[PDB]
Amino acid sequence: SLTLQKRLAASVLKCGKNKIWMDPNEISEISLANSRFSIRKLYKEGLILKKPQKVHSRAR
Amino acid sequence: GSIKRFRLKQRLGKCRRQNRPVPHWYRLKNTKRRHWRRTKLGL
Amino acid sequence: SRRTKKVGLTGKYGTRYGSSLRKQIKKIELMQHAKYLCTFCGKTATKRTCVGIWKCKKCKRKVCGGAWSLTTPAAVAAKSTIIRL
Amino acid sequence: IKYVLDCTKPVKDTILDISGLEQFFKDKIKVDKKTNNLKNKVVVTSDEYKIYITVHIPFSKRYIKYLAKKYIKMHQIRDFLRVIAKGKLAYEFKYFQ
Amino acid sequence: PKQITDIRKFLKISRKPDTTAVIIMKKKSKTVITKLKLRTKKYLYTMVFADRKKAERIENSLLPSLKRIYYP
RNA sequence: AGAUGGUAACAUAUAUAUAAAUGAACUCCUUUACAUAGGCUUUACACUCGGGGUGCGUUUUCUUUGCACUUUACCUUUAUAACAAACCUUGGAAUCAAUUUACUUGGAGAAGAGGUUCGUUGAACUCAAUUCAAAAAUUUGUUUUGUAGCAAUAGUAAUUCGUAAUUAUCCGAAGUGGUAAGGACUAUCCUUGAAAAAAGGAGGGAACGGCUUUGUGCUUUGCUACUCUUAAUACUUGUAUGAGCGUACCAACAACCGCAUCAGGUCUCCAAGGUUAACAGCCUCUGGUUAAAUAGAAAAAAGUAGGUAAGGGAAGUCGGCAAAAUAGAUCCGUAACUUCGGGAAAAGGAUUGGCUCUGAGGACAUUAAUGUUAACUCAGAACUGAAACGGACAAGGGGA
RNA sequence: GAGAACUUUGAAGACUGAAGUGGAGAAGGGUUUCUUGUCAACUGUGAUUGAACAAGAGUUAGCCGCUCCUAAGGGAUAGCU
RNA sequence: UCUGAUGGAGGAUCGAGUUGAUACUGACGUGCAAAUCGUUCAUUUCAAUCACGUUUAGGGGCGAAAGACUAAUCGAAAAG
């Protein structure tokens, strides 16, 4: 259902497909989006984010 | 491959064009079909 | 210090091939890898480049010689007879 | 060099205490790994809405944000406040969203 | 892209029939430094100006046939 | 009818653009254009460390903290700077000297001093323009600016504002040696490691101004502003730029070949962190995945893939098959025999963690003397522990 | 969604571990690509999934390649058999 | 003649990868597979390995030689 939007969000945010987060609710709005333009706009209004990269500390 | 000759590409297009079904309006008055994975063109 | 008692440059061959074969190849690799006297410049700097070609590192001039030494006794005597006349 | 940490907007809503912040910075900012050796090389003064930190040694402005987060986590308002830089030498407590 | 340093050559290139546009760029450094870039057929020629005054007389003194492009 | 500087190596055309430095036949070269091994070295990229800024995270306790971003293409003969080399001038070498990790080099001209060029690289160096003082009818020092132009206008990470715009940052110093390339070298071969298209350099010196005119392309008469090169324009030239073809996707993990959506096969490039000798093994970041012709429950026999076993230790078996036994590194010790090279990791001993220290190994400046600063590498000592320490991973059984 | 162990989303526990089911290509394939539908059969269980089926779409070069050169070599000319 | 360094030779050694295939005569043997899977083992500067191109064609080729290989076909291929 949301695989197209996952792929487009990965492209737009220049990160891995495994690093973009869709709002678990309001997925109907996400499904409405079908272009990089729409993906960009609902990333801007926060329905998709980019998860932080897993911490790899060099302290030890 | 991505690299092709003009004749080879035209032949591939012809095979794709012939792989289509019988028009519905005709059928109301096909056997020679192929799938890219089952039977190879060999040409 | 002294690294080999007698094997010399043939130490590269280890124990392989006979001792007589190694000794015979030593006696001529010694003179194949030697530096000879360049009569054109007087500096002992002519080394073998290929099997019959000897080049001086200074003059850059090259001469035809033996397979393993700059001159061969047969050709040395041959030239001497001609020069005698 | 002088640093400003404003709290006007939150302490107007009376969620922090400037004297508490002042005391935290006085007894918690460390110099030479020592926590109360400010003496004459680092000084910190107060204001009815600001906090003034005047340093005379190589000092990182990020330290102020570090202590401010530490304080507002100790007193459990961390989920409400953020420390956002405004100028070169100023931090300010902002609400979320 | 080429950089021209003296004013005489830059003005001469501006007066050529080939040149089409002048790009004016202004930006803060620490004082606004600027640079004027003539767009000729072959190359884009640039001159930088620390001097506000020189920069502010030169673009005016340039003749207005060729089109202005202000990037800031 | 063909320029000029330097003693020389060689250099010079910066016009929007270093375009033009005459040159035929005929020639002679160069580039294209080439192996392997070894180390040394430079640069870029990679990785890493510390500082500054920004954001996030942890926050019972500790933590001036952990993480992320902090960027810069081609092109400008890019200009310069630096350096391995080669060459030139001067110089004139034994008490031989210069010099490399290595050896390499010199009266066929070394060291020293001063230069030229190529090649590496590509803003280095005050590089460029600019401020301020000594040189004279244009040089040397001191400053400002600019990421050198490209260039910030782009990119990234942030803070906001109708919902498309404003804002601020994008800069200070290093270490390791992973990859690639280049350099100057040394060594090896009974092995010497393509060609041509194409491009360039040279030797040579055929031909020769312009207007007009004698006579027959040749002597001739009066006069001098005169040839090549790049760009644009106008007209003639058939229409006076840039043809045609490929370009999706897979490349195996289900897109290929194995009769298949088959645990098989199938060429190339990139290549992070920790431990480490290591692109090994094991764990991790980015990226990817959580899928496999099925699932759930139970869990006996038997099978299969393994573990562990008292005492004995090959009695088993055709046969130690299979398994077990150490196995890294450091220090010590090492026989017969031998083609003198080996045998050899022979055999066989000891040590090994953590912590707190001690010693040794460099670079950079001042008027024999005192400060600033960097690698992990070795050696030794105390302490400490359920005597354990190549703690997992990885990893010879030896001998006659 | 009629229907969800094997469709999608979020959360968790893990794996691959730069010698990778990570990125780019060649050979080979030839539309499998994309979007929208969609389930008779196939997708060895299910299946709403799909590389299946259906309708449309998608491949833009003076500078990346071919095209040119020559190599191992092939074909042909002159002859001669 | 001896000792210490330096140096970096060799169809030198160990060993991943590659290239193979010693043993378990393991699994499987109605296989994942008309030769695979696991562990073990050989091999890594050279008579090394790989790709594409190219040449040699059936009483012929090619063979570091097993009558091996020549498209699951070889003491004479395959097709008619």
- Strand G: which of residues 19-58 in chain A lie with Cβ below 7 A? 20-24, 27, 34, 51
Length of chain A: 60
CA distance E4 to C71: 69
Token pair in block for residue C76: 């040395």
Q: How far is the CA of C15 from the C1' of H22 (A)?
A: 27
Could you tell me if D40 and D47 are in contact, meaning their C-beta atoms sit under 8 angstroms apart? no
Residue C3's alpha-carbon distances to A45, C11, D42, in angstroms, are: 80, 10, 71
CA distance D84 to D36: 27
The CA dihedral of D27, D30, D31, D33, to the nearest 10 degrees, is: 130
Chains in contact with D, where contact means 3 or more Cβ–Cβ distances below 8 Å, are none
DSSP one-letter code for D91: E
Nearest nucleotide to C15, CA against C1' atoms: F341
* β-bridge mates for residue E68, sequence order: E22
Contacting residues for C32 by C-beta, under 8 A, at least 6 apart: C48, C67, C68, C69
Could you tell me if D16 and D72 are in contact, meaning their C-beta atoms sit under 8 angstroms apart? yes
Contacting residues for C69 by C-beta, under 8 A, at least 6 apart: C31, C32, C34, C36
Could you tell me if D39 and D55 are in contact, meaning their C-beta atoms sit under 8 angstroms apart? no
Among residues A13, A10, A5, A16, the alpha carbon closest in space to that of A44 is found at A13
Nearest nucleotide to B3, CA against C1' atoms: F246
Q: How far is the CA of C8 from the C1' of H49 (A)?
A: 34
Phi, psi at D44, each rounded to 5°: -140, 125
Phi, psi at E66, each rounded to 5°: -85, 150
Q: How far is the CA of B38 from the C1' of F362 (A)?
A: 72
Which H/E stretch holds residue E48? strand E44-49
Q: How far is the CA of E8 from the C1' of F139 (A)?
A: 24
Q: What number of other Cβ atoms are within 10 A of residue C44's Cβ?
A: 14
Residues near chain H strand, CB within 7 A:
C 1-3, 5, 11-14, 16
Chains in contact with B, where contact means 3 or more Cβ–Cβ distances below 8 Å, are none
CA distance D85 to D94: 10
Token pair in block for residue B35: 């799938």
B24 touches strand G (CB under 7 A): no
A4 touches strand G (CB under 7 A): yes
Among residues B20, B11, B17, the alpha carbon closest in space to that of B41 is found at B11
Q: What number of other Cβ atoms are within 10 A of residue B28's Cβ?
A: 6
